[PDB]
RNA sequence: ACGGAGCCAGCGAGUACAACCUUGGCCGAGAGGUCUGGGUAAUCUUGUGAAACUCCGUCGUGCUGGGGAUAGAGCAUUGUAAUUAUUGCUCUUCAACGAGGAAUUCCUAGUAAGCGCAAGUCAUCAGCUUGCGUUGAUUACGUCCCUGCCCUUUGUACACACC
């Protein structure tokens, strides 16, 4: 029911994909703290890696971390469907990827500057910093902060 | 890096049919072209191929004005200069290889930007 | 034929129809025994007639209740009324007057609704108000 | 002719409104009073109550 | 040679009551007069045809609505009855307002 | 008024596909049970139609 | 937003041996036991509060009065 | 004496029947489990990552026993609650259809569910016998 | 809050000179798709197996598994036509928000409030309105203090009448 949990091995800080993550949270919600990974995707990734769902991130072992990391970089290898992926159909090369911590923000930025260069109304709206998805702006977003 | 659209490269992009692009196209374009097409985009295709042919091979082809905003930019369109109706003005737009997938309306801003103060 | 009667009990929009027969002490609601009334915290509410009267009063009496309409607790109160009224009606019809009046004295001295249907029911809504008696906000300026 | 009965009654009412307003437009010079629409198994009798009956007949 | 019973059905409609009930009562009296077996004038839930409408034709004024409605009563009847007398009954005793419909269902 | 262009726009649906049957107007229509009469004319002719104020 | 709370970790997210002897020593002498009562003494995070509270139903260290969800009500074994 | 599923508390019956179906190797789970929301309203997969399908099958079988006969879309209406529609009022959202279809076919393979002439699926004699048997198991398990 | 499991209504509405309500069976993870079958209606959708609610677990005071705005990509539906995202669905970023000043609104019993469903807008779209039902109270059962209303008496240099 309970374990002393082997004092001297329970990690408290981790560095998975060059972002610091506190390990005392539940594994899935600890993984959620990396950009491009949410509760659903982290939950499925932890499920595929066979690591215990109710385990704490600071107590799982090292090769568990590496298997989890490998699973969540080439998802289609591990039977993660074509859907459920972050960036599907990938309009640069047509291969459904999944963007991650630095890759997500970077690639979003390249898509943004493409939309700026393409001179699309959406792109110029993004460049101005106004609302894009076609909602009223007379009464909303009335301060920048 | 050079331009590829969905693994179909720029070189393949210029010489390629509409239907294969539809297979490459997203869901909205897939439905639009699978729903049947009006005669007006076909006439636009014919006029634009004529305009591209007429240009003496070394300068920007003559601008073709058009009211059509609801049709999309197919791979046969790149290399073209079209004036999309804005409500007033057939706003100029040269069709880049990155035009494709979008409509024309995104490049004719129907509203002037608002400046306060 | 078997001495048997049919009574009913209502709540806001709930309705429990109870058939009482000379049985073996068999009390079912919707085909399930009374001990498994769903809200499980108003369960004592539906045992209330049983314990107020005493089970030995109806040990050779069987109870079958079909309850429909209304939400959970409304259904529960409907079963309460159905069981109580069925007991009273059966005792009046086939047992004796004194037993029936004793049951009524035991009942009406506790939660008068046990034999009398509740009269409170929802008030129709009106325009200019999102509630039956409430109203919209006023601007005034 | 198959149609929902409630829609059939609504159509009958709007047809009576049809007839009443049309007769009001036409027989106004006749001192029009009212119209009744009786429906039989075969004939749809339309009784016109008006003042100048003989002129209404023509 | 129409001895074959048509198990025929007579249903009614109206936006009013007294004439509808009168027609049903006359139908039942006719049915009993010639010794016909029947299921009585079974009442149907009066369908309330309701429209809510804003009173003001121009939106100005305090928000005031109204509800107009009719009620339709049906009261269908079916007869395990002979042929000619039934049809004669349907073709007689007709009141404007109440609408009679006949289904052979044989 | 080339027949190809005159009144060529489809009108199978939407606000202007159907009219008032009283006034020919496209605003404030009542489509319930196929009345197709706008609200004000309905208020005018409800009693003739069969509709009454009742509660 | 306004981090004026200035709260610390303040919760044992993982149980340690000395804390195990602590939970066991005042497993009795806590004449009323619940998840909130357990975490009141700074020695349990709150998720393992349920774990330790459920484990104490092993050798009858405490007795249940009601085992409804969303909480628990436990008294010392006498 | 005799006992039917109506004589046993529900939640205990679903739990025990799910446990029994999990213990035996029958009632194959679709390969797409562990990946599915089970409804558009839900926003996470079931907390019990493996074995929840057995519980769903148990509840479905009990439901078909209790009612007259039930199809798939009706189960879609039954399961699934209110979707947190972001910043919009909640509504009712029907559950996933594939999951309940797979449950129904799996119960068909086990013989506990039979195709009904009136449409949908009803209970079968063998499966109903199994249901009352496990109801008795639970009831004498209680005391 | 999130998982499972329990499983409870009442108002409606619904296709013809058009194509509505959709069961059920197969597909898809979902939206959805397809094949059939009912219903011109107490018959079929429908017992509208609705949400809140209940039981058992995960979470544990951390702007956190709250909050879901703003965006990126993709899949579908209605539509002649969806870009200035129609709408639905899948993955991700997850912002402000710590019970809100002056001030001000509604309401005395199945009432307020919470919760949803139906109908009117409707080819597609509600955070709207009109109705309906579920769970269901605290506090009055009084007063003219503020804001006004009714009658009487009085004064007025007011009658476009104390603006
Ligand atoms: Mg209310
Ligand atoms: Mg549920
Ligand atoms: Mg919420
Ligand atoms: Mg819940
Ligand atoms: Mg109902
Ligand atoms: Mg439900
Ligand atoms: Mg958060
Ligand atoms: Mg949340
Ligand atoms: Mg709420
Ligand atoms: Mg409006
Ligand atoms: Mg008062
Ligand atoms: Mg003067
Ligand atoms: Mg002054």
């Amino acid at each position: 029911s309970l374990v002393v949990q082997e004092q001297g091995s329970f990690q408290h800080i981790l560095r998975l994909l060059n972002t610091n993550v506190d390990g005392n949270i539940n594994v899935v919600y600890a993984l959620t703290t990396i950009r491009g990974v949410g509760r659903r995707y982290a939950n499925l990734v932890c499920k595929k890696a066979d690591v215990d769902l109710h385990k704490r991130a600071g107590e799982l072992t090292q090769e568990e971390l590496e298997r989890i990391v490998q699973i969540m970089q080439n998802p289609t290898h591990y039977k993660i469907p074509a859907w459920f992926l972050n960036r599907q159909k990938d309009v640069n090369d047509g291969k459904d990827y999944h963007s991650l911590a630095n890759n997500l923000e970077s690639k979003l930025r390249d898509d943004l500057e493409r939309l700026k260069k393409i001179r699309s109304h959406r792109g110029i709206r993004h460049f101005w910093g106004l609302r894009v998805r076609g909602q009223h702006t007379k009464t909303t977003g009335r301060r920048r902060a | 890096k050079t331009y590829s659209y969905k693994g179909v490269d720029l070189e393949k992009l210029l010489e390629m049919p509409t239907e294969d692009f539809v297979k490459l196209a997203p869901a909205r374009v897939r439905r639009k072209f699978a729903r049947g097409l009006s005669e007006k985009p076909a006439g636009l295709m014919k006029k634009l191929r004529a305009a591209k042919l007429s240009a003496p091979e070394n300068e920007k082809p003559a601008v073709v004005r058009t009211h059509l905003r609801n049709m999309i930019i197919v791979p046969e369109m790149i290399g073209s200069v079209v004036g999309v109706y804005n409500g007033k003005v057939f706003n100029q737009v040269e069709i880049r290889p990155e035009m494709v997938g979008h409509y024309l309306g995104e490049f004719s801003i129907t509203y002037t930007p608002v400046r306060h103060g | 034929t078997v001495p048997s009667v049919q009574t009913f009990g209502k709540k806001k929009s709930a309705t429990a129809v109870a058939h009482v027969k000379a049985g073996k002490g068999l009390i079912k609601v919707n085909g399930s025994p009374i001990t498994l009334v769903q809200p499980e915290i108003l369960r004592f509410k539906v045992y209330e007639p049983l314990l107020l009267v005493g089970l030995d009063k109806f040990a050779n009496i069987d109870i079958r209740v079909k309850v429909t309409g209304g939400g959970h607790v409304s259904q529960v109160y409907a079963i309460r009324q159905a069981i109580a009224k069925g007991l009273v009606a059966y005792h009046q019809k086939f047992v004796d007057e004194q037993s029936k009046n004793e049951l009524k004295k035991a009942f009406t001295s506790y939660d008068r609704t046990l034999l009398i249907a509740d009269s409170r029911r929802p008030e129709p809504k009106k325009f200019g108000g999102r509630g039956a008696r409430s109203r919209f906000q006023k601007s005034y300026r | 002719a198959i149609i929902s009965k409630k829609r059939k009654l609504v159509a009958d009412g709007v047809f009576y409104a049809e007839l009443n307003e049309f007769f009001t437009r036409e027989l106004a010079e006749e001192g029009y009073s009212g119209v009744e629409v009786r429906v039989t198994p075969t004939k749809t009798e339309i009784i016109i109550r008006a003042t100048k009956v003989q002129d209404v007949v023509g | 040679q129409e001895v074959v019973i048509h198990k025929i059905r007579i249903n009614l409609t109206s936006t009013k009551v007294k004439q509808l009930e009168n027609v049903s009562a006359n139908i039942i009296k006719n049915a009993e007069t010639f010794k016909l077996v029947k299921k009585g004038p079974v009442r149907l839930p009066t369908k309330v045809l309701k429209i809510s409408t804003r009173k003001t034709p121009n939106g100005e004024g305090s928000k005031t609505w109204d509800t107009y409605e009719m009620r339709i009563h049906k009261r269908y009847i079916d007869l395990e009855a002979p042929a000619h007398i039934v049809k004669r009954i349907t073709q007689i005793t007709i009141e404007p307002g109440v609408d009679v419909e006949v289904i052979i269902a044989a | 008024a080339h027949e190809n262009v005159w009144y060529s726009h489809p009108r199978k649906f939407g606000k202007g596909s159907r009219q008032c049957r009283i006034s020919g107007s496209h605003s404030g229509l009542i489509r319930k049970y196929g009345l197709n009469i706008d609200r004000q004319s309905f208020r005018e002719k409800a009693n003739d139609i069969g509709f009454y104020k009742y509660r | 937003s306004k981090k004026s709370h200035k709260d610390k970790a303040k919760h044992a997210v993982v149980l340690d041996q000395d804390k195990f002897d602590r939970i066991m020593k005042e497993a009795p002498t806590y004449r009323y036991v619940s998840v909130s009562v357990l975490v009141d003494r700074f020695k349990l995070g709150g998720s393992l509060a349920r774990v330790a509270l459920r484990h104490l139903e092993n050798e009858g260290i405490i007795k249940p009065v009601s085992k409804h969800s969303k909480q628990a009500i436990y008294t010392r074994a006498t | 004496p005799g006992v039917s599923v109506r004589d046993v508390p529900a939640q205990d019956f679903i739990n025990n029947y799910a446990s029994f179906l999990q213990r035996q190797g029958k009632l194959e789970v679709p390969g797409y489990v562990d990946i599915v929301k089970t409804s558009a309203g839900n926003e996470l997969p079931p907390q019990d990552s493996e074995g929840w399908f057995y519980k769903r099958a148990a509840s479905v079988a009990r439901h078909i026993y209790l009612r007259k006969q039930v199809g798939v879309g009706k189960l879609n209406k039954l399961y699934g609650g209110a979707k947190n529609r972001g910043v919009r009022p909640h509504k009712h959202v029907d559950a996933s259809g594939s999951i309940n279809r797979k449950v129904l076919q799996s119960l068909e393979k086990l013989g506990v569910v039979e195709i009904s002439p009136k449409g949908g699926r009803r209970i079968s004699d063998n499966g109903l016998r199994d249901l009352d048997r496990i109801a008795a198991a639970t009831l004498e398990d209680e005391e």
Side-chain angles (χ1 to χ4, degrees), chain A residues 1-4 6-145, chain B residues 2-117, chain C, chain D, chain E, chain F, chain G residues 9 11-78, chain H:
Chain A
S1 46
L2 89 176
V3 288
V4 181
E6 150 38 43
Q7 58 211 323
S9 91
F10 170 78
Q11 218 83 42
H12 266 269
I13 187 55
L14 313 166
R15 188 147 182 76
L16 278 307
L17 306 95
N18 84 347
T19 88
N20 299 17
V21 46
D22 163 30
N24 64 45
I25 308 85
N26 178 20
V27 172
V28 286
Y29 302 99
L31 298 181
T32 278
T33 88
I34 183 156
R35 285 211 53 172
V37 163
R39 51 182 60 86
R40 182 67 190 286
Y41 175 79
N43 187 5
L44 166 146
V45 163
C46 154
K47 272 148 169 45
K48 286 295 190 171
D50 269 28
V51 64
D52 187 293
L53 265 299
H54 311 79
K55 180 181 278 321
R56 297 296 156 95
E59 90 189 359
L60 64 94
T61 88
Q62 171 74 13
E63 92 309 10
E64 301 295 41
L65 289 167
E66 325 318 327
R67 206 162 74 253
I68 270 174
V69 158
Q70 273 294 60
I71 277 183
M72 60 66 58
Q73 273 164 260
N74 175 327
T76 188
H77 269 47
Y78 313 80
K79 292 341 181 183
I80 286 179
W83 62 278
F84 184 110
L85 288 173
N86 183 5
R87 172 178 257 282
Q88 322 182 187
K89 292 321 198 48
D90 188 354
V91 280
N92 172 24
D93 56 73
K95 301 171 47 51
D96 41 355
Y97 292 166
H98 193 111
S99 325
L100 268 306
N102 204 357
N103 308 354
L104 165 76
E105 65 97 15
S106 57
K107 175 156 210 342
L108 187 136
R109 217 170 57 260
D110 321 73
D111 206 21
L112 261 282
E113 52 76 21
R114 178 263 293 256
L115 290 153
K116 174 220 182 68
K117 185 167 71 63
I118 189 55
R119 287 286 153 203
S120 190
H121 159 268
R122 172 189 232 161
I124 87 163
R125 266 293 194 74
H126 270 287
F127 159 72
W128 276 328
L130 315 179
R131 297 284 184 276
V132 162
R133 285 166 192 267
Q135 58 270 359
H136 300 56
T137 190
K138 184 166 32 197
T139 41
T140 72
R142 204 140 191 180
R143 64 231 180 271
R144 290 148 313 97
Chain B
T2 38
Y3 198 163
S4 179
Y5 174 109
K6 273 185 175 299
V8 186
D9 194 78
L10 192 172
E11 264 336 295
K12 284 162 101 83
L13 220 36
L14 288 296
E15 187 272 311
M16 81 156 278
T18 50
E19 285 61 19
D20 161 42
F21 180 78
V22 183
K23 319 298 197 71
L24 268 308
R28 161 50 37 72
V29 169
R30 192 147 55 258
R31 160 169 182 101
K32 178 201 208 80
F33 287 161
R35 209 153 147 76
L37 256 288
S38 318
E39 51 285 20
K40 318 262 193 314
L44 182 31
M45 291 315 288
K46 152 190 303 162
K47 185 169 279 212
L48 254 290
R49 78 191 52 267
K52 264 193 81 53
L53 151 71
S54 66
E57 192 146 290
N58 61 352
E59 87 272 27
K60 315 262 291 163
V63 190
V64 172
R65 298 149 84 242
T66 174
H67 269 82
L68 267 189
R69 315 176 90 246
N70 59 354
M71 51 66 78
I72 88 162
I73 308 205
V74 288
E76 294 79 349
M77 215 149 301
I78 313 91
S80 306
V81 191
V82 281
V84 182
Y85 196 56
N86 212 27
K88 284 162 131 282
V89 192
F90 290 87
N91 259 348
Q92 304 266 112
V93 50
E94 201 293 329
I95 276 180
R96 325 287 281 292
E98 32 277 43
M99 270 316 79
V100 292
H102 302 56
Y103 289 43
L104 290 172
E106 311 64 345
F107 318 100
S108 73
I109 319 102
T110 73
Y111 72 95
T112 67
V114 53
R115 284 71 41 81
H116 294 283
Chain C
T1 172
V2 188
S4 268
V5 313
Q6 325 148 37
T7 87
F8 73 104
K10 316 169 85 82
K11 199 52 189 154
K12 278 182 280 188
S13 34
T15 306
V17 178
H19 309 278
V20 305
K21 318 143 51 182
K24 296 43 61 179
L26 154 56
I27 298 85
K28 312 285 278 297
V29 304
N30 263 17
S32 168
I34 164 176
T35 323
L36 301 323
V37 169
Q38 220 57 71
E40 62 76 10
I41 208 162
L42 316 203
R43 207 168 277 168
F44 268 110
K45 287 306 288 169
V46 48
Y47 313 99
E48 282 260 23
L50 312 178
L51 331 172
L52 290 201
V53 177
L55 320 92
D56 41 356
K57 187 73 76 174
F58 49 104
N60 76 16
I61 311 307
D62 73 31
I63 284 322
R64 283 196 184 84
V65 173
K66 151 217 269 175
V67 68
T68 89
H72 301 312
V73 315
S74 46
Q75 293 224 80
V76 168
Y77 280 91
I79 330 180
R80 284 168 76 262
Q81 263 174 50
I83 292 168
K85 199 174 304 168
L87 195 32
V88 168
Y90 183 18
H91 269 242
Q92 180 268 315
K93 200 46 187 315
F94 299 139
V95 176
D96 160 354
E97 285 298 317
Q98 323 274 330
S99 45
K100 167 208 75 69
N101 308 269
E102 191 56 351
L103 306 166
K104 297 181 58 36
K105 292 295 181 334
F107 278 139
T108 53
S109 68
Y110 183 108
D111 200 327
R112 164 161 151 271
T113 54
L114 269 191
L115 277 37
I116 289 330
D118 197 325
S119 80
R120 304 145 57 180
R121 304 232 281 280
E123 213 218 330
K125 202 191 79 68
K126 294 152 221 303
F127 52 87
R130 70 203 32 259
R133 182 95 62 90
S134 158
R135 294 261 82 64
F136 284 58
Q137 192 136 337
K138 306 277 285 297
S139 64
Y140 266 46
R141 190 183 330 270
Chain D
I2 53 153
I3 197 179
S4 189
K5 196 79 69 149
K6 60 179 74 166
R7 204 153 61 253
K8 170 179 179 320
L9 266 305
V10 170
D12 166 335
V14 76
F15 147 77
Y16 172 89
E18 211 77 10
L19 226 58
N20 184 282
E21 200 274 348
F22 161 72
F23 280 165
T24 289
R25 294 275 197 151
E26 261 292 306
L27 270 53
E29 53 176 324
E30 312 304 328
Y32 173 19
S33 76
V35 60
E36 291 255 349
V37 177
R38 195 185 329 273
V39 194
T40 71
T42 166
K43 289 181 288 189
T44 318
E45 306 162 343
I46 297 173
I47 291 95
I48 306 184
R49 292 187 322 254
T51 56
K52 300 175 183 288
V53 50
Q54 53 65 20
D55 164 336
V56 159
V57 173
Chain E
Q1 207 186 54
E2 277 205 79
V3 80
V4 279
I5 303 302
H6 304 317
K7 64 162 61 203
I8 207 190
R9 200 186 213 174
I10 313 300
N11 56 26
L12 303 145
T13 46
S14 157
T15 70
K16 44 173 51 53
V17 167
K18 324 282 191 313
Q19 304 104 318
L20 170 137
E21 191 275 7
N22 166 32
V23 153
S24 154
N26 304 7
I27 282 177
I28 298 294
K29 144 192 191 192
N30 265 314
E32 74 61 19
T33 316
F34 323 125
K35 317 304 171 74
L36 293 48
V37 293
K38 54 187 169 299
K39 312 295 281 295
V42 293
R43 274 77 180 178
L44 273 299
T46 78
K47 315 238 161 210
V48 291
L49 267 283
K50 178 183 91 49
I51 288 91
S52 163
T53 305
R54 209 151 187 287
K55 265 165 174 187
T56 283
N58 44 307
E60 191 285 340
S62 39
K63 275 66 190 149
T64 307
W65 301 67
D66 58 24
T67 66
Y68 304 102
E69 38 249 65
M70 51 214 67
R71 294 152 270 280
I72 304 137
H73 330 263
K74 277 158 116 167
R75 328 271 206 91
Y76 75 79
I77 294 101
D78 53 38
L79 298 214
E80 200 74 28
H84 52 77
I85 45 177
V86 155
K87 289 168 273 284
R88 204 181 81 280
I89 283 155
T90 88
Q91 298 150 320
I92 68 179
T93 321
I94 293 107
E95 192 22 76
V98 56
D99 168 314
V100 154
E101 183 156 287
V102 61
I103 307 302
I104 41 157
Chain F
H2 205 300
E3 179 55 359
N4 284 9
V5 317
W6 172 273
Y7 214 80
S8 89
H9 205 58
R11 273 168 178 77
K12 309 124 177 46
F13 58 52
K15 194 53 61 63
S17 165
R18 62 272 193 185
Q19 323 204 350
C20 164
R21 187 215 270 242
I22 281 315
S23 268
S25 196
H26 305 130
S27 49
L29 193 32
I30 279 311
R31 280 139 66 65
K32 220 164 185 303
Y33 334 107
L35 263 178
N36 285 269
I37 312 166
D38 64 341
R39 48 173 175 120
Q40 306 100 339
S41 324
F42 172 54
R43 273 184 41 75
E44 276 191 32
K45 324 312 291 283
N47 290 255
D48 284 277
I49 285 175
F51 283 113
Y52 297 82
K53 259 203 178 36
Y54 261 138
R55 166 189 78 77
Chain G
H11 284 286
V13 64
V14 284
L15 154 54
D16 200 293
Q17 182 77 259
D18 35 8
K19 276 171 191 165
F20 198 4
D21 321 67
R22 251 301 291 269
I23 304 148
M24 262 313 334
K25 274 312 320 173
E26 313 56 18
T29 37
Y30 268 133
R31 194 217 58 67
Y32 160 69
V33 165
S34 74
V35 316
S36 81
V37 152
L38 280 164
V39 278
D40 200 328
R41 308 317 169 92
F42 253 103
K43 29 166 201 178
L44 306 74
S47 58
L48 59 91
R50 281 183 308 289
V51 152
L53 184 153
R54 191 154 29 76
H55 152 284
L56 258 53
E57 281 338 279
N58 53 347
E59 287 100 17
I61 309 169
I62 39 179
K63 276 131 181 164
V65 202
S66 60
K67 50 190 77 51
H68 180 278
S69 54
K70 299 306 289 290
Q71 74 157 194
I73 281 152
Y74 285 153
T75 172
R76 285 164 322 93
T78 59
Chain H
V3 52
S4 190
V5 185
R6 290 181 218 265
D7 272 10
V8 65
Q11 170 168 322
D12 264 350
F13 172 101
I14 304 74
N15 257 264
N16 291 346
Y17 191 85
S19 100
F20 160 65
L21 268 68
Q22 205 217 39
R23 265 191 290 97
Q24 76 172 358
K26 320 203 63 71
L27 174 89
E28 86 305 25
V29 294
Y32 77 57
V33 301
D34 159 8
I35 319 292
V36 178
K37 280 193 173 177
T38 88
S39 95
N42 304 7
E43 65 162 278
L44 270 91
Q47 276 283 20
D48 157 83
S49 62
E50 57 304 350
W52 71 263
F53 188 91
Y54 300 87
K55 217 182 311 293
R56 169 73 71 113
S59 80
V60 168
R62 175 184 190 267
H63 205 268
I64 320 196
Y65 181 28
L66 296 184
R67 315 312 149 88
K68 199 79 184 55
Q69 78 301 338
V70 175
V72 187
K74 175 82 162 83
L75 287 211
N76 293 97
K77 192 153 99 141
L78 170 66
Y79 303 74
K83 173 171 211 292
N84 173 274
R85 307 211 283 125
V87 80
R88 264 181 310 281
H90 312 59
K91 321 172 59 84
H92 165 45
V93 181
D94 299 60
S96 72
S98 66
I99 275 190
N100 303 49
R101 254 193 301 109
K102 294 313 170 47
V103 164
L104 294 204
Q105 317 186 307
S106 293
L107 267 57
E108 171 36 33
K109 287 176 195 184
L110 301 210
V112 308
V113 162
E114 149 188 349
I115 308 307
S116 64
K118 281 344 175 199
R121 304 168 206 255
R122 55 174 165 170
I123 208 74
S124 66
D125 73 328
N126 264 17
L128 172 153
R129 173 199 298 108
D130 168 324
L131 257 45
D132 67 67
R133 260 223 288 279
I134 191 144
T138 289
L139 182 67
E140 280 76 20
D141 183 338
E142 193 43 57
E143 43 153 54

